[PDB]
Design a protein around this ligand. Sequence first.
Ligand code: HEM
Length: 184
Amino acid sequence: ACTKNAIAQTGFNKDKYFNGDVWYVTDYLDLEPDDVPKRYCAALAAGTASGKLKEALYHYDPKTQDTFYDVSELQVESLGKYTANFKKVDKNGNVKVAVTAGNYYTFTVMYADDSSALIHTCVHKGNKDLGDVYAVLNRNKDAAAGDKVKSAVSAATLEFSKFISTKENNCAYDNDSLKSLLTK
Ligand code: HEM
């Protein structure tokens, strides 16, 4: 279950964030115990495609090899806060699981600059009961979190020391498929 109304960044620059490029998750914080694996790889691309706000997601469990992509058209709740009915797709955008009512996530951009971001997401997926997940993003998949984003974690009244790193999982990403999925 989700419990947080995350506050969007003051002055959030949507066109910079949603520029069609890839963001890598470098660190995350799951508020529910035992909710997701400790070891994981995730990335996304975010952009406008033929006038529509879109996100493409990639998840990979480096131990099980469980892999999945998603694409969504984002709807706007307020600047920096979005809702999105996700469809699971293959890497080429072919639909594996259609959009369904009740399958959606919310997405709040709590901090962003050109190279780093802090987001909150609340995923709703039928009968599961996932909780709040915060993620530190970087444009560079290997970047250690810098002072701007770490300060934003503190300003959200969170402890960066509790975030789990994705860096020791040998994560490798198909950047091309994330970018192309934005159109699908
Ligand atoms: C930008 C950050 C993220 C977003 C927006 C996001 C969103 C989602 C969405 C929409 C799904 C359901 C997809 C589908 O069924 O088609 C999902 C599933 C999942 N995510 Fe994430 N995710 C993010 C990061 C992470 C991270 C960092 C982890 C680390 C463990 C993670 C673990 C999982 C797991 C284990 C599932 C499968 C849940 C299940 O079906 O039992 N996610 N995520």
